[PDB]
Amino acid sequence: AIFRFLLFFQGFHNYTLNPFHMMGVTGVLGGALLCAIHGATVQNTLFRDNQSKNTFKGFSTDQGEETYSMVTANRFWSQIFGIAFSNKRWLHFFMLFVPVTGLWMSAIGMAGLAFNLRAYDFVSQEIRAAEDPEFETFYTKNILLNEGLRAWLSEMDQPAKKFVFPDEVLPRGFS
Amino acid sequence: METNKLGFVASVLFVFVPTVFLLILYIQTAS
């Protein structure tokens, strides 16, 4: 049902084109990036606080000292990525801030799709493609795919509406 | 291209009205 909802939102709403959803995707993908990169950075800047090769026993709950070198991690990411965190508290606030604000921005995009206020189309390109039957962009091929989804789903998506589409008004791509 | 005319002036004030604010705040911090 969620998968139908996702494809319905593309075909009827063009939701990938919605910029608030693009920030949602950016926030969620960056949240996953931050989760992975912070875990691996901590795990690879650990201190030698044990004797065994299993470094998971090099940490006690009661200890008040950092279990990983923030200095070595800052050095590594400064010389790999050009920037690095130096503030641990800011790092963990960023790890909070990134997926939460992404998820909020996607919620703003859905609030817009409640009133059908859609980033469906770019008016300049729907114009140009219609005055020029040679102007093809990936966007025009997304608009065509959306029409294909819309006409080929809606007759069984909403069966209260009783949409009757004959086989020869359904947009085919010339099979 | 039938683009919004004010879409240029919307683009540049959207991105430099905050920017000068930040620079003001940075410069007064640095001095």
Binding site: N74, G82 | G7, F8, S11, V15
Partner: peptide, 30 residues
Amino acid sequence: MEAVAYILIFACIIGTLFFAIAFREPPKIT
């Protein structure tokens, strides 16, 4: 003039990226 805005803004991202690597605030150890 719509490409001009895009290229100017992309130049602004590139300038910020250079200045945030090259002229970054040094992290001092405590």
